[PDB]
């Protein structure tokens, strides 16, 4: 069923800087040692990216920051997440999300990756409940509350069963997952790349090229989206299902794409190592027009 989440600290989000991130491969054609211009939706360089946190600090009162809000979905979005305990379990995409217009769901319930585009009566506050027992050291999940009904459906995909750690790691974030979502001609194109990293509390500085992951022919109208999050329940969190919980430290970043012009550099190994935004500053604009990354 559905339960609302209480004892949370509702606060406005913050902002940070995306240093030349969100670049993905525009086509599946191999190129090497050539500068290739392109005309596609991209994340502009040094753009404002909205910061979200899922962190419950220790102390008497603390800050139970657990942010999974409904966010607008523009022509393109960029998603980045730093994870250590696999808290983010996917997203939901749709228009109204009240079983009036059909919507798609991407949920990783540990064993399988589930893609369903049905008439979902989505919950007000979707979450995934993970329980940590003390009789033994299991970390199973026993709560799955993402939607209320699945009356009419038209698409279904279940991946092969597997397992993950689901461990409450105490150290800093070590896994960086970046995602790019597009909706052109009913094809929900997803670009992703898993990259190891060693940061503390911020988006890392660097460049990365996202490989094409999978193409989803869906054909639905998407105007808003929301992110799913995990939830930890143990003997240190007494109360009912609405208050006896702890967050577990995680964070993610949400940015918006924009129709821009990019100059892409391919090395001798066939990978994108650098990019130039043609509409950022006159220096990079001159580099884009001259088609040279250098200029005398």
């Amino acid at each position: 069923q559905c339960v609302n989440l209480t004892t949370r600290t509702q606060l406005p989000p913050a902002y940070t800087n995306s240093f030349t991130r969100g670049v993905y491969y525009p086509d599946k054609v191999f190129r090497s040692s050539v500068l290739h211009s392109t005309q596609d939706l991209f994340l502009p360089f040094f753009s404002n990216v909205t910061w979200f946190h899922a962190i419950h600090v220790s102390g008497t009162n603390g800050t139970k920051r657990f942010d999974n809000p409904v966010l607008p979905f523009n022509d393109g979005v960029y998603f980045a997440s730093t994870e250590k305990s696999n808290i983010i379990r996917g997203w939901i995409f749709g228009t109204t999300l009240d079983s009036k217009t059909q919507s798609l769901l991407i949920v990783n319930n540990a064993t399988n990756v589930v893609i369903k585009v049905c008439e979902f009566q989505f919950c007000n506050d979707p979450f995934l409940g993970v329980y940590y027992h003390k009789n033994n050291k299991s970390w199973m999940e026993s709560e799955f509350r993402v939607y209320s009904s699945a009356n009419n459906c038209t698409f279904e995909y279940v991946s092969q069963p597997f397992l993950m750690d689901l461990e409450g790691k105490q150290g800093n974030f070590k896994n960086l997952r970046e995602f790019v979502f597009k909706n052109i001609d009913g094809y929900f194109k997803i670009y992703s790349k898993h990259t190891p990293i060693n940061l503390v509390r911020d988006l890392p500085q660097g460049f990365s090229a996202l490989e094409p992951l999978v193409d989803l022919p869906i054909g639905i109208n998407i105007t808003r989206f929301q992110t799913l999050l995990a939830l930890h329940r143990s003997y240190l969190t007494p109360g009912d299902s609405s208050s006896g919980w702890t967050a577990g430290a995680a964070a993610y970043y949400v940015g918006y794409l924009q129709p821009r012009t990019f100059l892409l550099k391919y090395n001798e190994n066939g990978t994108i190592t650098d990019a130039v935004d043609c509409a950022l500053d006159p220096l990079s604009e001159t580099k884009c027009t001259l088609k040279s990354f250098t200029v005398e």
């Epitope: 940070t16 102390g59 105490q170």
Partner: antibody, heavy 122, light 110 residues
Framework: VQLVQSGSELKKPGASVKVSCKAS????????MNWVRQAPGQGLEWMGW????????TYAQGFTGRFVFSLDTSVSTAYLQISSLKTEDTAVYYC????????????????WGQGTLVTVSS | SVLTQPPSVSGAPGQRVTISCTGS?????????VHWYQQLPGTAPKIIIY???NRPSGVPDRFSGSKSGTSASLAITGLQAEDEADYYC???????????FGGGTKLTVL
Amino acid sequence: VQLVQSGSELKKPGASVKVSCKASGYTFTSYAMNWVRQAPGQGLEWMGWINTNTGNPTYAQGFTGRFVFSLDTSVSTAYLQISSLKTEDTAVYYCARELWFGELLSGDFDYWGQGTLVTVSS
Amino acid sequence: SVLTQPPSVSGAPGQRVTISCTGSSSNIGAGYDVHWYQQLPGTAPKIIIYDNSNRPSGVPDRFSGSKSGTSASLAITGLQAEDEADYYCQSYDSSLSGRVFGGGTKLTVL
């Protein structure tokens, strides 16, 4: 992420001194501004913090009135102004970066400035 | 200060030296984390352990620490010549004191 402060000043007792702190490489409105003093050959003292969004200061005990916290978002430079300088105010003042988490602040000072030396003597 | 630190410690190069720390039920016993800072002479302090167990990036593996109820401790393994500095501990007390720093402990390497 750089935290550049002002240079060293030599001031007479009973005067007033202003100390500036430049921050760069990060979104200045996202992190709270903290000020930590240190007497020579002594421990570190925390005289309070000032929010970067609303600009309201929060002084500690014994620092009310004489110490003024202010900033502006055009240049994103924090200001530290001290009035009625006395001999015991001779200390190095450090700027500390803290993430804006809410009404209850954490205890993580990730970045520190180079420090500002002020000496009150005749 | 509310947090109490030993005045100084000494040890041979290469062995293990443990620096202790004690507080009360309002700073460490209340569940707030204890942070540790390292300050070379003439330079700014540098935090080497946060949230009582975790090392930031670039911090060598020789540094380790833990907390046990009211008290907390930090461990040094394999002393060298570059460890000659002053170590400062800090935490969060109640609202009447706020942030409370330690007394400081000079580490001596023979």
